[model samples]
Target: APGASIFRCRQCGQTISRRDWLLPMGGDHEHVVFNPAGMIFRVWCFSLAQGLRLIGAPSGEFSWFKGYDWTIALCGQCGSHLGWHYEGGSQPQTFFGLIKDRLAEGPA
Candidate 1:
């Protein structure tokens, strides 16, 4: 299972298996909108050890947001937003930058 993928919440240390991760959309009304290039500025992922090391602490104190249901923070070890989670049944997603300015491109 070297290549097998697994997901862990950075805040709660909750492990979400790949099978449970890819839940059915349930309905067309819940379309996960994306750009032409297919980009969503939400959700993120990171290694459990890496995430813990980065946070400089265990994934225990963080709590899932009620309304937005997302958590953000700079990795304590590397000062980066290793991953994020959202409310609902969506799988946790990972990104390379802060959610606020994540989509902004450099001046042309």
Candidate 2:
């Protein structure tokens, strides 16, 4: 895993995922989304990830992707809310919408 770009949780400094899993959408991987609660989320779409805890029941309310239900994604080590995990869809089927700033990048 040497020389790999890694992303870590900002809250507790635990590894989350790798840059290689980044999945591009609309020609880009990063997207800005506004939640119903008025919270703005800068998310990076990942095709796969590790070290994440998906919590609560999946919901389609306010889902960024149609035909997908999302669950809250938290840091497995720290329990800090990192983003949402999307499941169910045609194009992607499953993906991770991880908060950008909530993660720190470094080489592992």
Candidate number of the best lDDT: 2
Q: Rate the local accuracy (lDDT) of all candidates.
A: 0.32, 0.89
Per-residue lDDT of 14-96 in model 1, one digit per residue for the tens? Answer: 33223223332222111223434666544322212234222333231332222333344454444445434333322323212
Give a tens-digit lDDT track for model 2, residues 1-108: 556499999889888888988999667899999997899989999998889999988999988877989999999999999999999776888999999999988888
Candidate 2 residue pairs that clash: none
| Winning model by TM-score | 2
Global lDDT of model 1: 0.32
Worst 10 residues of 1 by lDDT: 99-108
The TM-scores of all predictions, comma-separated, are 0.27, 0.92
Off by over 4 Å in 2: 1-4
By TM-score, how accurate is candidate 1? 0.27
In model 2, the Cα lDDT at residue 44 comes to 97
